[PDB]
C-alpha cells in the first residue's frame, strides 16, 4: 500500500501508456 500507490497516486505513467495497450 504505502510505497505503490502512493507513488505518483493515480500513476499517470501507467494511464498514458496504458491508453495504447487499450487500443493496439
Known amino acids: 500500500k504505502k510505497l505503490k500507490l502512493a507513488?505518483?497516486?493515480l500513476a499517470p505513467l501507467w494511464k498514458a501508456l496504458a491508453l495504447k495497450l487499450k487500443k493496439a
Do not use: V, W
Open 7 to 9: 507513488l505518483a497516486k
